[PDB]
Write a protein that binds this ligand. Structure first.
Ligand SMILES: C/N=C(\NC)NCCC[C@H](N)C(=O)O
Length: 64
């Protein structure tokens, strides 16, 4: 994980998010960010769902 940059993300960046449904970590890609709410919508890669997560709650992209 990239701890130092774990609050700032940009649209089009890959990440990991906590799926609200399993509570588990899954790979997701940032589709859009609302910097005012400090949240962003991410699309779960491989699944095709999109969920709104906090920028500071996002997790580093999977590479393994
Ligand atoms: C981010 N993860 C997912 N979707 C966006 N997973 C969908 C399949 C897993 C789900 N627990 C099931 O078995 O239905």
């Amino acid at each position: 994980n990239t701890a130092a940059s774990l609050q700032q993300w940009k649209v089009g960046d890959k990440c990991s998010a906590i799926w609200s449904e399993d509570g588990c970590i899954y790979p997701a890609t940032i589709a859009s960010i609302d910097f005012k709410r400090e949240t962003c919508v991410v699309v779960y890669t491989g699944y095709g769902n999109r969920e709104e997560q906090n920028l500071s709650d996002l997790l580093s992209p999977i590479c393994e």
